Structure formats: C-alpha cells, structure tokens
Amino acid sequence: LRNFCVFSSVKPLDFCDQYSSPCSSDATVDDGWFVCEYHASRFFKMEKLALAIPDGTGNNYYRTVGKSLVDDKAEGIERILIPSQNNYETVLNLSLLGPAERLVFYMIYDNKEKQNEICQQLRMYERFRPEVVEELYNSTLRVLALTNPNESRSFGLSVEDDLAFNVLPTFIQNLIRKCVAPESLTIGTEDLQLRNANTCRITSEGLLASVRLYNSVQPKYLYGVNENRLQIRNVLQFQGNANALQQKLSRYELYQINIPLFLGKQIIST
Amino acid sequence: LRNFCVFSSVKPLDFCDQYSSPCSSDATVDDGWFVCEYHASRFFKMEKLALAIPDGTGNNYYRTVGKSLVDDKAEGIERILIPSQNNYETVLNLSLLGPAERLVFYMIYDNKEKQNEICQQLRMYERFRPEVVEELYNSTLRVLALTNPNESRSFGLSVEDDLAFNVLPTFIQNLIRKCVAPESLTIGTEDLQLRNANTCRITSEGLLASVRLYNSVQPKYLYGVNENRLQIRNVLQFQGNANALQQKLSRYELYQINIPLFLGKQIIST
Amino acid sequence: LRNFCVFSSVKPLDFCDQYSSPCSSDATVDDGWFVCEYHASRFFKMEKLALAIPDGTGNNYYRTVGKSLVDDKAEGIERILIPSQNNYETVLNLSLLGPAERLVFYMIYDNKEKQNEICQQLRMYERFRPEVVEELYNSTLRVLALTNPNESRSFGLSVEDDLAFNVLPTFIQNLIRKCVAPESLTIGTEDLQLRNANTCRITSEGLLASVRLYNSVQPKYLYGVNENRLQIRNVLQFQGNANALQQKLSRYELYQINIPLFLGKQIIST
User: Fold this and answer.
1) How far apart are alpha carbons A82 and A261 in whole angstroms?
2) Is B239 on the interface with A (CB under 8 A)?
3) Which of A136, B140, C49, C224 has its CA 20 to 30 A from that of A176?
C-alpha cells in the first residue's frame, strides 16, 4: 500500500476527470495509525509525534504518539479527541459529511446496517463511475483488515477505563493504542516513568483530553481562518518591550508547551 | 556411498520434481559419524573437529571428535547433546518433525513398533512417488548396517557410565564413540593425557554437556535469527577502547574457547 | 496473488536452498477454491470441473464444480470428501503430516490453541530461516481473508444439512459452496434442473459422497502405484474380443461416468 490512510480512498463520487487526495506527505509510512496527520487533525484533532526510548547502547526504539490539538478553552464535545461508537455521528458531523466519508466512518465503527443502507443508496452513482463504491469499499476493508488482532497495555488505574476501551471498535482500539503513550512503560525488567500524571482519558464518550492543560501548539493544517469578515474577542495583551517580556531569553532552548497523550501503563517483555 | 549422512535420504514425500539435500560439504567423507556436520549441529548440537596424535616420526593419526555447541546458559534438556532411547522423542521433538525424519529417527533408536506404524501410515504416500518409503528405508538400513560390531574404550570412572552407554542403540553408541575423545589415551605402551578433566557425561538421559564450561564458538549453521521482529535482553557491555580492552593483543595467536567432548579412557594396542 | 492455493506457501522448514511448489498449473486462477487441483485431489479427493449455463444469446456463465474421486468400493472414512472440524485430524492424518501443512490446516479449521502451540513449537526453526513460520502465517492468513463474507444457497431438503453446513469453518464453507453444484438452479425467473437427485451430502462428519455411484475417472495425480512389489486381488475380466465387447461403438461420443457434486438449490437473482 503506497498510501496507508483509511480516508485516502475517499474521492468525489461524481464524474471527476482528476482528483488529488488531501493526505499529507506522511501518509506513505506504516506507523499503525492508518490515518494521515492531516486527517487525524481534521477528524480526531491529533497530530503525530515520535517518542524515542534509548536502550543504552545507541539504538533507539521509536513509538508513535498523539499530540492533542484541543485548547484549554474548549469544553464538552470540543474536548472529545476520538469519539466512541456511542456518539461518533454527532462528534464527527456524519450527516453533513459527504457520502464517501460517511460510508468510511460507518465501516470504521462497524455499523453493518448503516453501511448496507449507504451502499444501497449509492448504487445510482455507479452510473457516473463503475468504481464509486466498489473499489472504495475494497480498499477501506483491506486497510481495516490490518488492525485485527508480548505487549500488555492497560489504559487506566480502574477497570472502568479498560472496559470502556474494550467495547470500542478494532480500528478505534488500534488508533488509541498507537496514539496514546503509556504513563510508565515497563521494558525488559525496568520501569521507565515517561510522565507522572495522565493526560488523556478513555470513557464511554471515547478518548478525551480531560485535563485542562494549556495548549501552545500551532496546528499545521487547522490554521486557516476567514480573514475577510470581522470578528470581536477580548484577548490578553502585553506591552511588547524586550526588557519587560524578557525577549533576550528567546535564544535559550525552548520548552514546547505541547499536550501529548499519556495514559495507563505498557509492558514490553520478550 | 557418495553421501554417508543417515539423514541424507530424507526427502519430501509429496510429488516434488526436484530436491536438494541440506547436507554439508563434509557429508561425502566416511569419518564414522554417518551424520553430516549440518545434521549433527541441528539435531545433536555438535560440530566436527580433528584430533592429530603424532607418533614421533612425522605421521599423524587423525581421530574425529565432537565440539559441543551448548552454551553455559543452557540448562536441563538444552544440555542434552545426544538423547538416549528413553527420552529422544521429547529432546528431538519427533512429533513436530516430518514423517521421513521421524521414521529415520525411529529406525536409528530401534523402535520396531513405531517403525512399523510409521510405515503402515505412509503407505498412502506411495501414490505420489513409488519410492517415498521403500528406498528411504533401504538406504537408512544399509547406512545403519555399517555401525554394527584392538580398541578398548571406557566412558567413565564408574560402572554406571559404562552400563548407561551399553544400553544405548548401536548407531548412538557408534556416534558417541566417534564424537567423544578420551581423557587419557593409551597408545602402544605409553599414555597420552589429552585432558585432565572430563567435559561430557553419559547417563540414562544420554550424552550431556554436564560441565558449565563457557562456549565462545559461533555455529556455522545455527546462526540465523529472526531479524525482523524485536527482542529484549540484558547483555554485558564493554567500553570499546583499544587500550581498555587490550585490542593490541589481538595480533597474538588466539586460544579458542571451545568445548570438545572429552570423557573416559581409550586403549589402542596392536 | 500469483498463486491462490492456500497450501502454496508450504515449504520445508529446514535450510533448503531451493524448492518448487507442487501446485498444479491451474493454481494461478482465482476460481474461489483457493486450493489447486493437485492439493484438492490429495487432501479433499476432488478434481475441478467447469459448468456452463447458457442464457440464450451466446454468453455462458461458468461455475466451478467438484468432481468426486471416491470410488464405489470406498467405505466409511474413505467416503469423506471434505472433513469437518469435528474429525479433520483423523481424516487428513494431521499427526503424520509435516508441521507446515499441519499449521496451515489448523489455521484453515480455526483452532486457535493448536495454531498457537504449533507456532510456539516452531520458533526454533526460525534459526535456519527467519521466515519459516512468519511469512507462511501471513500468506495463509491473507489467503483465508478472501473467504470471509444475491446468491441464496441451500445445501439440503432438511434443516439438518443447513445447520451442519453453518457450523463449518469459513474456508470450508467457501470450498463447499464453490465445489458443490446445485441440484436445481434458479436463475432470473426460471428454474434449471441440473440433476434430479443429489450426489453429495453434508453432515456432522463434513461433506461426503454418500451415494455409491460408480466412478470411472482416472485421477491425474493419484495415479502412481508401487510397481516394484507384488499385490493380489480378484478383478473382473472380459474376453477381449471386439465383437463381444462391442469395441466398434468406441467411435461414438463417450458418456463419461463421473461423479460431480450436486446437492441442494441455488438462487441467483439480480
């Protein structure tokens, strides 16, 4: 598979002579997400980060991790990173989404009746192109087929988190496992405490950024705004003086205020 | 016999147009082992070594000897070099082995009922090739027929070792006699003390590497590993400095830390 | 997939420099069997036949069908064409079969514990080749993944046959559906009675050739016999006279006495 993004196969179902997939340049690597960074930020509000674990001889074990794009001002449904099968339609706005994306999301969350209904209502578009729904279905199914089942991953200090994670779809479970780093890894015979407190939670609503940590990250895809019209807000302002703002400290190494997803424990022994 | 290995006649019993025997290049010599170095390392975990005894006029009497591939970390069943007829099935994993190798091992250890059962269950494969079991049986029997009975070999300081060696099958007895060198040879009228302590033992379990000697030999056939996946272990590490590691001594003649099989006494008088 | 046979990936797990798959020349077509004719005859005792249904304008719909190689003299277990998950080990002689074929059959019949056990006992063979069990597992799983779920197929006049077919593994179900032709097809709005009586049955033992029909087919792979030794049987004999045997009728078109698998009904409406 040249492109591993599950949404890569989504194309306009009308008679389009040419189309370019909006997947990012990182969609060609098989990191286990099966979603490109652009689609992960657009739908699940996450970006991709690398986590290097050094053994002590030079080799580094790289593990992918999700960086939350949810701001501290966001509340309620805006804090849901990965919606669960209970309320994914409202979180992802499936009704407003196009039929291809809607069908892909239905297959991802394993809603057989909805997939069948969408297919039987998209039969007519087979007139424009004989592969509007067939090849998309085959590609999405073959991409999802790689997510089915030494690692021992627990996603919480209570059985509630584990049972909430268990009932999630297999693709959602794989995405959560790949995007959520452990609070305290257990590699070989030693424990590596990556962080002392959790950053994301797993409940019936799905994977959320429960803690109100400050996010100082500029999204690389969710950055455009309607510059033409006018908006009113009460922002905080500083003077703009180098001595007052201590701008002379900008030459020092910057500690990025990011929100990586850290939750639970992982055990890697082999 | 171009090939003296007892496992050389083992071929896939299905309809195979062509097949190449995995025997090593040394299988063409008649050293008395009747097993190639590859098969000896694969099954009995031994390699072949030559032992030159000089008389004093220039001529050298060469005797084959077994070099143990068992590491010091190996314990229990992993230390069994040549399994005895009591527990050869578990040591060699006969159940997992193919029918041809299983039948060959059954004939080697002289288990008449098992040989008959394997033959009567391999009758059906005669449909694919009319020599799946016939020519294999004849070749293995004719190879084993060379192992039946001035040398006087004792395999221990106690009668227990001798009685344990006696009850072993004739092929196993020949292999042990050829692979185990004497601790102190007695040639002509003089004794040549090859080593002062034994290295291998013979008990009801068979021929084992009882002593926990360090093995610093790289196997020439049991060297492949699963490079694709990941494994975790706590190895010992050095700095990698020439002065610290005394690398300048590498130009000196190297004393190989091998584990040749030395046990008992041999008497050659004629 | 160049080769669609599920047993194509089976290779000797030892250090083999070269190996040629015993799959027939028809293993390259995707007929839905996912087993070559050679392997189907060797294991399931079936050969492949084509069944052309003419619509009336020239186009022919081709459906694959299984031809039984079971003779009328065969009785009991010899009449089992496709063993069910209840007694497949005894029918296919899994214990005598090699570890690769045993693991493939275990994966086909979906016996998770046995697959895990065979894998954990074949770890050691990873020393010889790092893909003895990994690539075989991936290839077999990806071949089986094509068998998972307008056609309406009933495999009997009673609910017992349907429930016996339902409990079978998905690969076995696909093989039975592809190899067993319907007694009376129902295409479009008309019924085409291919045969008036069933030829194969489906019970808890699997798919069997219950009827004692005479088989006058010469197998193209199960034809070799042990010519070297001697066998005794009481065959039927004719004189060998052209007038007595009516050999002059040989120029007429020959009605082949075959045993194609016909059972149940099929409905194709779209």
Assistant:
1) 12
2) no
3) A136
